[PDB]
Amino acid sequence: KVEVNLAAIPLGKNVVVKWQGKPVFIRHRTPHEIQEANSVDMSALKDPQTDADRVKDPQWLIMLGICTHLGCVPIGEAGDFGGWFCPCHGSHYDISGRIRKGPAPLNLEIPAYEFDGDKVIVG
Amino acid sequence: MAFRKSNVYLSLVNSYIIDSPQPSSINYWWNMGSLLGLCLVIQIVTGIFMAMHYSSNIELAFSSVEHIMRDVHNGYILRYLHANGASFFFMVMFMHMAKGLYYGSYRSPRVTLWNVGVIIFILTIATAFLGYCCVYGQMSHWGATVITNLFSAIPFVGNDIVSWLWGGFSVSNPTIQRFFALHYLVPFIIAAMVIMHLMALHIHGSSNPLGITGNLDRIPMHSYFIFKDLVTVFLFMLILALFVFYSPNTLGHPDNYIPGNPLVTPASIVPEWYLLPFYAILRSIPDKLLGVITMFAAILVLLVLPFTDRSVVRGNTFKVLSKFFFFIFVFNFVLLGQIGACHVEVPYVLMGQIATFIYFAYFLIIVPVISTIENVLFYIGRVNK
Amino acid sequence: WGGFSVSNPTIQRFFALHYLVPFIIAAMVIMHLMALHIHGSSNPLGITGNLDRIP
Amino acid sequence: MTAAEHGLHAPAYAWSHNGPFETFDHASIRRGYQVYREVCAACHSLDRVAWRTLVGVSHTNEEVRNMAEEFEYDDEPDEQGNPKKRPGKLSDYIPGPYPNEQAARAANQGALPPDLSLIVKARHGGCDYIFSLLTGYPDEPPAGVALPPGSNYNPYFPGGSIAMARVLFDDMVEYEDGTPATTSQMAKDVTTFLNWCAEPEHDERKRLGLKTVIILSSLYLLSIWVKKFKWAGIKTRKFVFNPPKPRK
Amino acid sequence: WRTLVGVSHTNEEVRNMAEEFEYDDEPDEQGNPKKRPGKLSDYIPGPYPN
Amino acid sequence: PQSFTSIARIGDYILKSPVLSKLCVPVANQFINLAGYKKLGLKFDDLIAEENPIMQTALRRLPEDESYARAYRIIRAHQTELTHHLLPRNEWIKAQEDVPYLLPYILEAEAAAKEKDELDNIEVSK
Amino acid sequence: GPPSGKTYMGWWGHMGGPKQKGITSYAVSPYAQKPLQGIFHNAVFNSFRRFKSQFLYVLIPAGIYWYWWKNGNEYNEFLYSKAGREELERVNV
Amino acid sequence: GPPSGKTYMGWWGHMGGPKQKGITSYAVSPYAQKPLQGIFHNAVFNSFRRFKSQFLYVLIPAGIYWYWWKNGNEYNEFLYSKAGREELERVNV
Amino acid sequence: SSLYKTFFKRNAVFVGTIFAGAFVFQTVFDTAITSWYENHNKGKLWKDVKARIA
Ligand SMILES: CCCCCCCCCCC(=O)OC[C@H](COP(=O)(O)OC[C@H](O)COP(=O)(O)OC[C@@H](COC(=O)CC)OC(=O)CCC)OC(=O)CCCCCCCC
Ligand SMILES: CCCCCCCCCCCCCCCCCC(=O)OC[C@H](COP(=O)(O)OCCN)OC(=O)CCCCCCCCCCCCC
Ligand code: HEM
Ligand code: HEM
Ligand code: HEM
Ligand code: HEM
Ligand SMILES: COc1c(O)c(C)c(C/C=C(\C)CC/C=C(\C)CC/C=C(\C)CC/C=C(\C)CC/C=C(\C)CCC=C(C)C)c(O)c1OC
Ligand SMILES: CCCCCCCCCCCCCCC(=O)OCCCOP(=O)(O)OC[C@@H](O)COP(=O)(O)OCCCOC(C)=O
Ligand SMILES: Cc1cccc(-n2nnn(C)c2=O)c1COc1ccn(-c2ccc(Cl)cc2)n1
Ligand code: FES
């Protein structure tokens, strides 16, 4: 388990840390895209959740990439909405991390990060 | 008596390779078991001399194989003989098993001889998997990732077996260091099962291509089958030397010359040619737990074959319909290897599902049905009622 | 040595030979028990034991 | 998949080391190192190759000593414990242009150029793929293709979009022996030099294979003759049956 | 540092002892070196560089 | 190992039916000629596998002049195969010589073994 | 040592077949024969006789599995070309 | 299998000794006997009888080699002390 | 023929003449192949390129 602080995150990036030997994608979430993350209808997806059950974080955004296809990886935020266009089979998706554009029906495990008193522990 | 018959150690040599009574009419298909003992000696000797220069750490494994190819005197000969000698070990073993299918060698009284040979086949597949991961190329990392994640689908003990098999949270430094120590050991367990294989052969002897008794006409082993063994030994070494010296990278993948990277996925993940038919059986079941059971049941279905053969005659020499369906099973095994090297696409998904059905229906449906039909055709073609 | 003194090639080849020789000892133990089987054991009196045996 | 996602198939050129009795052309390995030093080495490392392996293959012992002494290497520290530097010797390896891979991506717009020590064995196609890539940049992409900014079109690359621009142009290198340095001439010389970097045993392996095949094919023909001699009594054996009288 | 927790000091005490030393980090995005304070998985440092 | 009692039970039902005999018997005649054991000088009862106690009983009870003739046909077939030839056409087994000489000894050894099993696993009916 | 279970093979002198009577055999030394007198007629006439007896049990199953692979390979090439784009969308649902 | 060379041991029934005639033996079941009735007299009287019969073959060679080591150890301690310095120079030439 | 009767006179060779002729075979076989291999590749070897820069 790695331990990072609040403002010590790499904010304007998509840093692929090898935490636990696993690729993981990290993004600073500005509070302006609560209007903009969920304008996508999740009925164009195959299974919906919410933003709430997925992202329990107001201003940070983490999801890992041990993919069930074979374990692919995307390219940083170009493409369609601010999401992540992937060069393996042509997948790209929303700013939050839920796939429908391209053949990937499921979605990934979110890491069990945890907050306790000006700390967050990815693990 | 002679000294070779009275000495305790020379009597075992005399009773196996000198004075052993052999059937007179066995052909060159009975020479494959002698070639398999030569293949096992080449793999053990070339591997011990390469192990004096090898480092099994995760940041030293790929560069020590490159050190063998460049700095060790005749080190490229040691590696190419070892990498191509593993493909020749599997080609002769496929021909040895198919000889027993055609001539009815699995039948009684040789059922214990057939069951020990199935154990040898499972241990050889495991050995070639463990040594391929010790190169730590790009094909070695993602082939170990696919196979070890299959055991996470077992109920209630999935996540405990896979973490104990990794030594951590992924394929890492403890995975490669324990895969090399297990790769040194399992060839010595195969050598102990080969001795138990020859002990079961000694009490009944060999069969013959006619399927009838051989106790009426025997010749000894020395100077007939010693010099008939030499013909296929020199042909084996000549074809193997043409691959080692003139085309040493035909039976491999180019992606295994890239160092392994856990953050970059290759475009295609394909095994070696001798694991391709069992890889297409695994990808044909959409469920994840049912695919692992079906891939291991493709080897264990050879054990049901003494019970589903309902014929009173041993072998396929005088059987018309059994000869036709034997070669359907053979070319279905080649199509399963070609499907396992393609992409998951239309129409290769349906073609691999029908071919997986024909693999299992041969042992369980086709063989007991046409054995019974041939028993009745032999009867009513002679009896006049 | 593999070189001019006791160095890195000396230790890497000493470990590979250390893995192998215990398996050669195990094959000589089987040949040891085969020679024992044809005559049996002796006894502390030094005389024949074919008159009184137990399994 | 689509043919654009596979890449175009590379044709078969007549390399002079193709064939079971052929060696490398060592005047083309020497010409190919000069195209490496003046063109390729700005962004590519050659990390598996030592300086000493070039002596007797493409340069003399006096030439390689002067090439190695133009670079600086780390020495053992001082008596006070301070670091030091030293020129190169024959047991060193050829150095690369970047200190780490973070600095390599920063100079190439995020892309990482690979190590070229094994690039011939690590691509499907071999020498024919490397030659077709360097000479296969079109002057314009075909109509309809949308390239990202910072990418170039090459039909032999899988996907058609590569992060390397066209580098080879006519008469950018002045050869020592007087060969005209066109685009196709310089692309042929690097591919011969890079095949030697991946397989430095190639000339010796094909000579030991000539001795092994002659001996093993003579032993195969002699063993067929010996087997037919020792089996001649069994193969012409004859059997007669006279049924016994029913006394019994 | 982690082997001292539960033997002679608490978890809160060893975290403050490790954070008084400086360790090498992964390099920058430009490729420049960096430094960082210590954590529990580090080893106790020595006084001399060589 | 089906049974020789089960083979004769199915085969006698076919030969007594008038419409099943016209359809299955010409197929059985081409099946035997394509087998090719008569070109090696063998009968069908030489081909039965013999490493079972039922077959060892039937070979003991065979008369002595037929056991001598059977041993010669097996030895002659092993020599013909290792030379990779066939016999001359005047030494092929004809259709009226391919008789089941061993079948009546097999059927009486099997009926005695079945009767011993039904008496060793019998239930009283008080 | 003790004896073990019964077998179906013996050794020289007690091999375990039926009793033989009435068969006589003849042979001639290999040193008295002319060397390699089957290099011509066995290689042409006899190997042709062994080939064509067993070639329909092998080439009829081989032609079935080669026709099947060739049509599946040609249909996959049509689906990923430009002309086969609206058939690709409906066989992927 | 074939037979091998002759031995001096057999198996149960044909072990290979002389013929026996005239000897009779008697035994009693272990379930009919009182447990551990040799824990006292065997441990004191009988083990003392076995000890003192064989103790002079062991302790006379043991006392020779212990007297030899003890004088060589005490002479080496004298040679490297202060009083044994002029003897050390003449036994080292 | 008769030239395999002049040297041996109805016998086998012997075990020592096999080992003696095997070492004489190795030095003549190695020299004859290295001469044919370097003549087949003349002009491409390093000893031919080294002369043309001098
Ligand atoms: C991985 C590489 C391994 C290399 C070693 C393996 C080689 C063994 C190949 C498999 C095999 O055993 O098949 C043999 C089979 C013939 O068996 P048979 O006893 O009925 O024929 C005795 C012969 O007439 C007289 O044989 P004879 O003793 O007179 O001459 C010896 C012959 C050499 O033969 C061999 O070494 C085995 C091929 O010399 C010549 O051919 C002269 C020309 C130079 O052949 C056939 O039935 C069909 C032929 C093709 C089968 C290949 C299938 C592989 C997929
Ligand atoms: C886990 C399960 C593993 C199972 C592995 C299955 C794949 C095995 C691959 C090898 C298959 C080769 C078959 C070997 C079986 C040998 C027995 C046999 O078939 O007998 C030879 C056959 C009939 O022999 P007869 O005794 O009747 O007379 C011969 C007179 N010429 O006479 C013949 O017809 C000649 C035989 C020629 C066979 C050629 C077909 C095989 C081609 C394989 C190609 C594979 C690479 C693409
Ligand atoms: C039944 C015997 C064996 C089989 C089938 C086998 C198989 C293999 C295979 C397929 C590889 C990968 C080759 C490559 O692609 O480079 C390999 C690698 C290797 N094997 Fe074996 N092996 C056997 C016995 C042994 C033994 C007994 C040892 C050591 C004492 C050994 C040592 C090695 C080593 C060091 C490698 C490292 C990679 C390399 O050098 O190619 N092998 N083995
Ligand atoms: C890998 C090491 C193996 C060795 C060294 C070996 C060795 C041998 C040898 C020397 C023979 C007798 C000669 C012959 O019939 O060719 C034989 C026969 C046999 N083997 Fe193997 N074998 C191996 C693997 C296998 C496998 C994988 C199987 C089956 C799944 C098998 C099953 C049999 C059978 C059934 C026979 C008897 C065939 C007959 O008598 O007609 N063996 N083996
Ligand atoms: C790993 C090494 C060895 C093993 C497993 C082993 C095992 C055995 C066993 C089980 C016996 C059976 C009877 C008994 O326990 O006395 C025996 C007897 C014997 N062993 Fe060993 N032994 C080993 C080493 C040796 C050595 C180093 C020697 C002599 C230099 C030796 C010489 C003998 C002799 C002479 C006997 C017969 C003694 C008698 O019957 O009175 N063995 N051994
Ligand atoms: C004659 C000169 C050169 C040769 C032979 C050469 C060779 C190669 C090769 C073989 C590749 C890999 C292609 C593949 O993976 O399929 C490559 C990629 C690359 N090269 Fe070069 N190179 C040369 C010069 C240069 C130069 C001058 C640059 C300057 C920026 C450069 C930058 C790159 C980059 C960024 C890549 C990665 C492309 C990608 O992954 O999309 N190369 N080069
Ligand atoms: C039916 O007819 C047959 C029949 O035809 C045959 C051939 C056989 C013969 C059997 C075989 C050919 C199979 C036997 C093969 C094995 C048992 C394989 C075992 C392999 C080994 C024991 C390999 C051991 C190798 C080493 C220990 C390597 C040593 C390397 C060293 C010491 C390197 C260090 C060197 C230095 C200088 C430090 C039969 O038994 C038989 O049945 C009657
Ligand atoms: C005039 C003569 C000239 C002839 C020259 C011809 C020489 C040709 C040699 C090469 C030909 C084949 C090469 C293979 C070879 O040599 O193999 C060596 C012996 C074969 O194995 P084996 O030891 O006989 O069997 C070995 C196994 O079958 C026997 O099992 P085991 O465990 O040993 O049983 C006893 C168990 C004891 O166990 C215990 C607990 O004590
Ligand atoms: C998936 C993939 C990709 C690349 C390489 C390799 N691989 N691994 N080793 N070699 C030589 C390779 O080609 C693989 C493994 O492919 C298979 C197929 C079935 N098994 C298998 C079955 C039973 C057991 Cl016990 C162990 C393994 N493995
Ligand atoms: S990664 Fe699942 S479709 Fe691209």
Coordinates of C-alpha atoms in Angstrom, one line a residue, chain D residues 16 21-24 26-27 56-59 203 206-207 211 214-215, chain I residues 25 29-30 33-34 36-37 40-41 43-46 49-50 52-53:
Chain D
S16 CA 24.1 -11.5 -50.2
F21 CA 27.1 -21.1 -47.9
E22 CA 27.2 -17.3 -47.6
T23 CA 28.9 -14.9 -45.2
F24 CA 28.3 -11.2 -44.5
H26 CA 32.3 -7.0 -44.5
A27 CA 32.7 -3.9 -46.6
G56 CA 38.8 -7.9 -37.0
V57 CA 35.3 -7.5 -38.4
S58 CA 35.0 -3.9 -39.7
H59 CA 38.0 -2.0 -38.2
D203 CA 29.8 -16.7 -40.3
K206 CA 27.4 -21.7 -41.1
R207 CA 30.9 -23.3 -41.4
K211 CA 31.0 -30.1 -41.2
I214 CA 28.4 -34.0 -44.2
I215 CA 29.4 -36.3 -41.3
Chain I
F25 CA 40.7 -37.6 -40.3
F29 CA 38.7 -32.6 -42.9
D30 CA 38.9 -29.3 -41.1
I33 CA 36.4 -27.3 -45.7
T34 CA 37.9 -24.0 -44.5
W36 CA 36.4 -24.4 -49.9
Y37 CA 34.4 -22.0 -47.7
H40 CA 33.4 -19.5 -52.2
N41 CA 33.2 -16.2 -50.3
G43 CA 36.0 -10.6 -51.8
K44 CA 33.6 -10.4 -48.8
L45 CA 35.9 -11.5 -46.0
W46 CA 37.7 -9.0 -43.7
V49 CA 38.6 -5.6 -47.4
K50 CA 41.7 -4.9 -45.2
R52 CA 41.9 -2.7 -50.3
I53 CA 42.3 0.1 -47.8

